[PDB]
Design a protein that fits this description.
The structure is a homodimer of 93-residue chains. With 93 residues, chain A is mostly beta strands. Chain A is 0% helix and 49% strand. The PDB classes it as chaperone. Keywords: alpha-crystallin, chaperones, heat shock proteins, single particle reconstruction, chaperone.
């Protein structure tokens, strides 16, 4: 989960490369008022059991990440969207 | 760009993690008659100086991937799909 953290004047924007991940496999939470938490685990591709694996580089697993926000976030204002393999978490300041 | 290479009884299937890449930035071709070429660019969101970066782990720029297909592969029947940051190329046998 390679991630970026940008602070525009309007909000804190986090990006996470989570290719091939479904929302039911990712989790965005807030702890102790100012700690953004991103975790998950890409599911096994329920693809043809018996296939021959010539080469496998894409090998993702479980993970958890945390960031200390500069200010307590208004959890009901935090937006999180998943698109084209990129998770985006916007935190309004 | 991380890629998997699996083989089904019907075709060789290639997967590529391309988070944050729109189908207009990816190119799928067959060079020299039997070389699969997956390339494109993961555009950097330069933005404005008003912004402030606290963390940067995600990569950007050009990517190039080449696999040598069989001298007898349905080169005219290769399909390419892009969904949830994952590219899939199906080369019929």
């Amino acid at each position: 989960a390679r991630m970026d953290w940008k602070e525009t004047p309007e909000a804190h924007v986090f990006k996470a490369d989570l290719p091939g991940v479904k929302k039911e496999e990712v989790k965005v939470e807030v702890e102790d008022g100012n700690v953004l938490v991103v975790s998950g685990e890409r599911t096994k591709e329920k693809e043809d059991k018996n296939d021959k694996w010539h080469r496998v580089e894409r090998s993702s697993g479980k993970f958890v990440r945390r960031f200390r926000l500069l200010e307590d976030a208004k959890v009901e204002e935090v937006k999180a969207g998943l698109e084209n393999g990129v998770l985006t978490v916007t935190v309004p300041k």
